[PDB]
Design brief:
homotrimer, alpha+beta, 60s Ribosomal Protein L30, Chain: A, two-stranded antiparallel ribbon, 4 helices, 6 strands, 28% strand, binds cytidine-5'-monophosphate, binds 2C-methyl-D-erythritol 2,4-cyclodiphosphate, binds manganese (II) ion, manganese ion binding (chains A, B, C), metal ion binding (chains A, B, C)
Chain lengths: 156, 156, 156
């Protein structure tokens, strides 16, 4: 009986590789972020965290209080999940939506699903990921950055 | 126990008429798309499809594999729905949110609801549609395109 | 068994103070709107209203039909809620997501939660609020306006 929503973006810049949903995808530009700018996992975390009312992943700091920072989005997701289960919550299902003009996400979706399903400890049927463009409109339309929205559903 | 989320946009261009939620709305510009750029139904489909974990409407191709393409958003929605029920899923409720500076959506909402309620086979009380502008900000603020977000809830 | 989604934005302009989630936050610019441009509550209302299928807060008019207009977002939220309960609906949980480059929302979240929890009559554990930026991208990236997304979950 708990719904959750997350949103997140990151601007392009830097050298090559970008990481999304935990997968390393080839691309001319890279993603600027304090950590691996995995917008997919950040949005997913915020969603999960939002449903359990623990307030975004930002509560997990950019203060790098000797514990969390210097850690990829995957570790933060597992950590946040560990705290959510602590409040006796169990995963119902999650849906992620990546918004980018490029690169093509479709081929990497399955592997993303494998990762998320591992970190949240569940089967892949409980996690869905899709991608969409903004038809060359917006900061996404241009290759300025990538955005991602995620909804989550937890059970008690 | 299944939540779903969808997002979708389309840029303006072309002659007159635009189609949204299945309704033909008068407007100076038109919507550029491979098929009738019905952002409302596409977002709705992705949402429904996301909850049943079948990965966006794009999995239904733009490869036009002799079967699906040359078909309006309404047919795709009914098809996707047919496949979702196949996995023993039944509709709970859906909410659509259209983001456009113009034209005015409010008057066409009721008819949109009729269409969606037909295609998904349910009563109108299980489908809600609303509209909002971006106060002349963004590619939506300008008359560059229309975007739409949709959430869905399926039951087993 | 009812999900709901809301979205809303407002452009900057005017003198000082902005109101978000019912809290008065210090800021160089202000928010242009027919009423206190509380994007957080508007998105929240639309969400709640969407789940009960009553079609956005705009159905509550900008026609100022002697009843509603000249009223802050807080009164509209309580009113909309009063009508939702009328249809025998009860609150399950809600999650809000504020998208702004500035000002910093994090410190005001707790108080926002207090307000929402009062207006909807429930405990704070049933209401979550978070904030995020667009890394200086988009009309939000620039200080052009503030946007906000909200999901809601109602029970019968
Ligand atoms: N307007 C904003 C935007 C983001 N934030 C906060 O800063 C943190 C990280 O924001 P970003 O994800 O945008 O970098 C979060 O904890 C969030 O609550 C804020 O307090 N006010
Ligand atoms: N960055 C992106 C954006 C869209 N896509 C894919 O292309 C298809 C259609 O995208 P559009 O709706 O943006 O036209 C979808 O199946 C989607 O998964 C992608 O693989 N990578
Ligand atoms: N394209 C649009 C955008 C908003 N609207 C309507 O106008 C009202 C308020 O819109 P804003 O929140 O964007 O100011 C709502 O009731 C909404 O349904 C519309 O009818 N068509
Ligand atoms: C650790 C954080 C904050 O520094 O990494 P970030 O790269 O900056 O990404 P962010 O979008 O800001 O989301 C919050 C955190 O993941
Ligand atoms: C058939 C598709 C893909 O060609 O039609 P499109 O018009 O292109 O619209 P789209 O947003 O890309 O959503 C996917 C499909 O509906
Ligand atoms: C009363 C309304 C409509 O005038 O106030 P607004 O300030 O204009 O804000 P809005 O975004 O348009 O949301 C609808 C209503 O809250
Ligand atoms: Mn991020
Ligand atoms: Mn589309
Ligand atoms: Mn508003």
């Amino acid at each position: 009986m708990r719904i959750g929503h997350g949103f997140d973006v990151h601007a392009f810049g830097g050298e090559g590789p970008i990481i999304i949903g935990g997968v390393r995808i080839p691309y001319e530009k890279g993603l600027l972020a304090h950590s691996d700018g995995d917008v997919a996992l950040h949005a997913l975390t915020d969603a999960l965290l939002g449903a359990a009312a623990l307030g975004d992943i930002g509560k997990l700091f950019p203060d790098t209080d000797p514990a969390f920072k210097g850690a990829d989005s995957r570790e933060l997701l597992r950590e946040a999940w560990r705290r959510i289960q602590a409040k006796g919550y169990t995963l119902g299902n999650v849906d992620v939506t990546i918004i980018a003009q490029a690169p093509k996400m479709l081929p990497h979706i399955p592997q993303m699903r494998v990762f998320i399903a591992e970190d949240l400890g569940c089967h892949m049927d409980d996690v869905n990921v899709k991608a969409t463009t903004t038809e060359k409109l917006g900061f996404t339309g241009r290759g300025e950055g990538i955005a991602c929205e995620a909804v989550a559903l937890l059970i008690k």
